[PDB]
Design a protein around this ligand. Structure first.
Ligand SMILES: [K+]
Ligand SMILES: [K+]
Ligand SMILES: [K+]
Ligand SMILES: [K+]
Ligand SMILES: [K+]
Lengths: 321, 321, 321, 321
């Protein structure tokens, strides 16, 4: 039946899976203690001002006032009371026992000031809990490479292969693969490149490196005249110092945040003359993917042990003679 | 007249269209009951603390106080009153009947604590109603494929074709098409690929797969020597087990979120020797698109019933002899 | 001197320039009247509830209460008072004259409910003023095409050219150009394509269509054997029904929102045998761009009046004989 | 050992490194004084209204009221008191001394109005402190070009080279390089291009311009028949007026904001017959990058002083004879 329903939906089911710009990430909870401190500082500061004012105006000795005398702020009898009024103003709780009066302009202006300050402050609190909210780090890896890469024969050509798959049913828009052989080398003129990155060809020029990934795919590198692996046999493989890097880029269907997935195979991690265990099965009305067979491989004794280079050379001696 | 006005505007009119990172999507309204619970828990907790304090300080028996005795918080006569003061503090309603006094530091500190807690809490409430606000799922599909794909003759070549169109007047920046024949196969060496994805060529190498989509377009795949459809005739079509996938990627003009539109044609869903009904008409000063003709097709009896492979083979026998 | 400073900075100066997902864009100010309505509805509803409660409990006739009788909410003497208490609760103004008491659980629960409701409501208000805040429409066009396109001779080849430029000093990351001849045509087999889009080659295959745009650039299309313009002379130009579309895509340096800039030239809008007036001048220590010369052009009488096709044909008759 | 751990992690360590849409960026702190003004204006306006009402209703002479007379708003004895009530309403502090009463509908409606206004206002305040919060300018440059570019011999070919490196351990998804020779020139037909941008080939056609950048890389431009540098020797280099631009695009792993890094080399800034000092060293279990050697270079006297053009020409005279 259908691999892709007419609406784009996929027919597969997955089984058996195991300046201050730095302030956005500024801290885990240290920002919370930071803001709690921000408040405390502002509350204590304005309380001291209100207490200074009540002290000077002489309210401390007549906090409630009377017919002849009106406090700047009612009911401030000390610094503790002062502290309270400041809080109630900024928090805008405003119980009202401590209350401003029309007497002192300085006091009124001070409330006016404290109100704006207070607003700005928690306004920023929402911004910091915005930044730190969505600006992640450590996004779960949705993509997977076979633990090993395989060298075997497919359709007459000798090929290095490895597997990639999505752990999520979510699609990868504009996905493409790359590979490089990495190793030190010395140029013809005797120049030293400590680690050289040599492209390994997955089909870029025809755009076959463009992939549609639903179920796990085996990526093919034909080893040929233009391959850095052209002169390598199965024995060389248990010798050589080279390492292969593999990449899969693309964009998460939901985010449109381009992703780059990486992994590596040492010469020692490449299994010659093997093949991957099929991960995809058809059961009646729909397709299943058994993810336990992902890394699993099996020997193909009929696989030639020599290098692709000698493989091709031999062909012509069986031609010429 | 003009297809594209000098300012970029398009001249067409459309007619007849029918960790906790998972918390962003955490729920529909279960988050609302979650937060309502968050509040309730904090309100009840602080009320119990205030009630514990009023109990110990002995306020329950003299809630209003007198000349010789001052409560930590005025007017707490029970747990219900206690509950109320907690609410009024956090909500910052602060009716003021239940009111803090300068007596108990513990109480003052508790208010101080409850104020910061309360702020943080709803600060987060705005973040959750941020995440859940714009982080969508199920974005309406703006793109469309003809229900069927057609095989006919164009400009001398035999071609598999299918239609794509935008349901919205909104443009697709950097849009491109891809296609693959999907089917099981067994390699020369006898290896089984359960479902193989073979590229179908829409013109990638010349970059003709890059498209400017205003009105609906017919996508052409020339069936030639290098096509997987090269050896297929009209009769094979009512036999074969293959399925074709089609893709259109690009980015919504507004969002710049790369989109990937999918659809499929079974061999059985491919109509041989047909053509699409034109969707675009010119009326005087501007262009119309009649979207009722989108999926509509018609027979072209002059269309050859054989495979493109034999089509080409025959040419040379009418050459040689 | 330098076009690009060693830090990447550019040395040019510019002169003489003239479900409810739809709710994000839901309205201009109709959303503001919407929310104002949202509040009003909630305020009136809860006030009616509080008034219902005060009515039943018999508070209307003893609003202040006394030694033997305690109202659910103090000082509710009517619906107007009721309305007020509801407001003061939700707004959390809480003057305190109308005040809740520990008597009626129903009332307490109602306050509890109204508090959460109120919070959720304006929480959403911040989300709507978030969506409608940054989710724009009508982004100012930063990119510009010469009003006309020119056909002239450059470096021995006959070429259709047109100009593009940035109105902003801001760079375009990964910018590239495309062009298409648009016109109706009838296929060899007699099929009608109402408007056909034919690629015009700006150098894609070598990736010369990739451009670095600081000062305005002239885009070149070599008219050759593979060009749809190959058979066109200056006289044909004052006849033909074809139109040319031009595109420039890329991403705004700041936004990384891919942009697609469009414009068109009718055959009648193409000026044959002309050239563009240079927009870029060097003055001593830095480069200026005079944007008044952008669309300006001048005749080049030495320009051949014939089609590039006959231009090439003639070459060989002056070869053969 | 490993360059890339099996999970994608990199094995290198770095050492020795030194309408109103314009309102988003509208100002540094001028927006803060703007909003503070926004509040003040609204507070003063509503206070004047409340004062107008209290004046007309005759409350000024009986602010507290009595058995026979009820003020619209209690305790407004002047404009200063009026100012206060307005503040306490909007801020929702609501001390309660100045308090609304059920008498004047006009007043009630006014409170109702002031409440919604107040909410909208600071709602917007959160949006402006949203825009101005994350919409940056001046993002730190994470990418680096060698101060100079080198011409030397590698693997038999004469090549212009320059270095690029990431200052951050953060990866660049889909990174690619470009280069252009920039200089004035006059066309065959005698047309003047003030500054011409000529592509310099870094391997685009094979997609070798696609790079995987962990440690700093040397970018190679083979100087050959198709190079604008083909006819240039070491002596020409101390003469010529040309400048070379270099670009590196790609997307920051975290942001997915495409970045374009630029830099330039004047003919005078190109060091002929040199090579770069290796920046990468292997110490036991892991790789180090010494960033002090980045710009450092050394002479290679064996480097030919002539132009690649004559280099190749000479080859055939040592062939022919
Ligand atoms: K209050
Ligand atoms: K309040
Ligand atoms: K109050
Ligand atoms: K190519
Ligand atoms: K409040």
């Amino acid at each position: 039946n259908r691999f892709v329903k007419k609406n784009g939906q996929c027919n597969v089911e997955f089984t058996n899976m195991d300046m201050f710009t730095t302030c956005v990430d500024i801290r885990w909870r240290y920002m919370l203690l930071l803001f709690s401190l921000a408040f405390l500082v502002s509350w204590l500061l304005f309380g001291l001002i209100f207490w200074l004012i009540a002290l000077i105006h002489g309210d401390l000795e007549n906090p409630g006032g009377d017919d002849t005398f009106k406090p700047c702020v009612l009911q401030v009898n000390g610094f503790v009371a002062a502290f309270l009024f400041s809080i109630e103003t900024q928090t805008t709780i405003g119980y009202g026992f401590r209350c401003v009066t029309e007497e002192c302009p300085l006091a009124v202006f001070m409330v006016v000031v404290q109100s704006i300050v207070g607003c700005i402050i928690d306004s920023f609190m929402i911004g910091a809990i915005m930044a730190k909210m969505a600006r992640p780090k450590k996004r779960a890896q949705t993509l997977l490479f076979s633990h090993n890469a395989v060298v075997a024969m497919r359709d007459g050509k000798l090929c290095l292969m490895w597997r990639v798959g999505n752990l999520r049913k979510s699609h990868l828009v504009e996905a493409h693969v790359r590979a490089q052989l990495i190793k030190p080398r010395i140029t013809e003129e005797g120049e030293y490149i400590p680690l050289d990155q040599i492209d390994i060809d997955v089909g870029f020029d025809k755009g076959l490196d463009r992939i549609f990934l639903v179920s796990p795919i085996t990526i093919l590198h034909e080893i040929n005249e233009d391959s850095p692996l052209f002169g390598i046999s199965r024995q060389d493989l248990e010798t050589d110092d080279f390492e292969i890097v593999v990449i899969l880029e693309g964009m998460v269907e939901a985010t449109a945040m381009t992703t780059q997935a990486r992994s590596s195979y040492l010469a020692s991690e490449i299994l010659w003359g093997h093949r991957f265990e099929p991960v995809l099965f058809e059961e009646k009305n729909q397709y299943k993917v058994d993810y336990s067979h992902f890394h699993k491989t099996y020997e193909v004794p009929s696989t030639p042990r020599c290098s692709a280079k000698d493989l091709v050379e031999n062909k012509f001696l069986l031609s010429n003679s």
